[PDB]
Scaffold this active site. Structure first.
Site, short mmCIF file in Angstrom:
data_model
loop_
_atom_site.label_atom_id
_atom_site.label_comp_id
_atom_site.label_asym_id
_atom_site.label_seq_id
_atom_site.Cartn_x
_atom_site.Cartn_y
_atom_site.Cartn_z
N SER B 99 63.92 89.37 49.58
CA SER B 99 64.96 89.95 50.42
C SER B 99 66.17 90.31 49.59
CB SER B 99 65.40 89.01 51.56
OG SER B 99 66.56 89.58 52.17
N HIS B 101 69.02 90.43 50.69
CA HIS B 101 70.15 89.60 51.12
C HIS B 101 70.48 88.51 50.10
CE1 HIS B 101 71.27 91.14 55.14
NE2 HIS B 101 70.00 91.50 55.22
N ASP B 108 74.40 93.06 56.84
CA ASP B 108 73.95 93.65 58.09
C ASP B 108 75.20 93.82 58.94
OD1 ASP B 108 71.32 93.70 57.23
OD2 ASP B 108 70.77 91.79 58.08
N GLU B 157 66.29 100.82 59.22
CA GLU B 157 67.27 99.78 59.55
C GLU B 157 68.70 100.33 59.43
OE1 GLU B 157 66.62 96.04 57.63
OE2 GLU B 157 64.44 96.08 57.95
N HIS B 160 71.58 97.90 58.16
CA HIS B 160 71.45 97.15 56.90
C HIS B 160 71.99 97.98 55.73
CE1 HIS B 160 69.06 94.43 54.07
NE2 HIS B 160 69.22 95.51 53.33
CL LIG Z 1 67.95 93.02 57.68
ZN LIG Z 2 69.66 93.04 56.44
#
Ligand SMILES: [Cl-]
Ligand SMILES: [Zn+2]
Ligand SMILES: [Cl-]
Ligand SMILES: [Zn+2]
Lengths: 181, 184
Positions: B99, B101, B108, B157, B160
């Site tokens: 990820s 992140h 996000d 997304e 994101h």
């Molecule tokens: Cl996400």
């Molecule tokens: Zn995200």
């Protein structure tokens, strides 16, 4: 005061609520929340909100800090949510316990205030499991009871049922079993 | 390799093929001074310093056009991702280490008009549309744009955003993914 407005009402996949159903005694409990501001999910029915305040007080006495995450959720909200997953919380509109105003999702900072299985392994989740009944709450969807409740384990999801919680807890029952359903 | 090269770079590419070191946590994590959809300070409150200051600039540019953004989740550690992955196998598809992140460069974001949720509905809001066309002005890209699933490995997304700095404008104008821009 009808059957579905009962504090002991059963709402699940089989038994649903009226589509216009909104409790008329919604209030925000005086407890810490995982988000700031006032939203519809801030509310519980008055009896359940007072019980939630009691529960959080009892937790605090033992060094347990709980946060309220999500309470009342309307029929309309559930409808949109069901669609977003038609593409577990896949409850059809009118079949989520959150519409009763008797249910609060709770978590803890140790679990990032998130509604995940990890909450069960925190001291807060463990405490909640063994103490919710002291304020008339049950863990609605306990582990291993999926075939009965229709839901996988949710250690964050508590339902106010009043005095019968103590018997339900002691007998390790689901609300369905207690009600002979 | 299944290991992202230059893993600590602002332009690092982390995806289903290229993973981060399991013990990587950026050393310059801070909480950006922006509104959040949740209360308290948690792991997801943080971004690396350069991305945090960029997010502040982005939200300020938004405000000047009457656009109110909320931050929903930033940094997510390897260990957090590991349990989320396990408890979703028993898109949330990212294996631990894979990820973005975990880089601390990714936030996000959502808006009240979308009830602060990370769903396609954000794309239909004035805020989501604004973000699509303006994120690059603060060095951010929409990491998983619509139609690029075959390349990024992810469906659209709109919520994101990934900080990459100056190259964001070029990536935006050329309608490229980060993978393509970096020849990966
Ligand atoms: Cl996400
Ligand atoms: Zn995200
Ligand atoms: Cl729930
Ligand atoms: Zn719940």
């Amino acid at each position: 005061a009808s059957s579905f407005a009962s504090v002991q009402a059963v709402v699940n996949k089989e038994y649903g609520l009226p589509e216009d159903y909104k409790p008329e005694d919604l209030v925000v409990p005086n407890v810490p929340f995982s988000f700031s501001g006032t939203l519809e999910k801030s509310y519980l029915r008055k009896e359940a909100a007072e019980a939630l305040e009691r529960l959080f007080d009892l937790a605090n006495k033992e060094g347990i800090q709980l946060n309220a995450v999500s309470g009342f959720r309307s029929y309309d909200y559930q409808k949109k949510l069901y669609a977003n997953n038609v593409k577990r919380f896949s409850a059809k509109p009118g079949h989520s316990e959150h519409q009763t105003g008797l249910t609060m999702d709770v978590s803890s900072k140790s679990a990032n205030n998130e509604l995940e299985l990890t909450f069960a392994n925190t001291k807060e989740g463990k405490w909640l499991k063994e103490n919710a009944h002291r304020a008339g709450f049950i863990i609605r969807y306990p582990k291993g009871k999926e075939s009965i409740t229709g839901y996988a384990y949710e250690p964050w999801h508590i339902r106010y049922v009043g005095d019968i919680a103590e018997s339900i807890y002691k007998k390790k029952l689901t609300l369905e079993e207690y009600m002979n359903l």
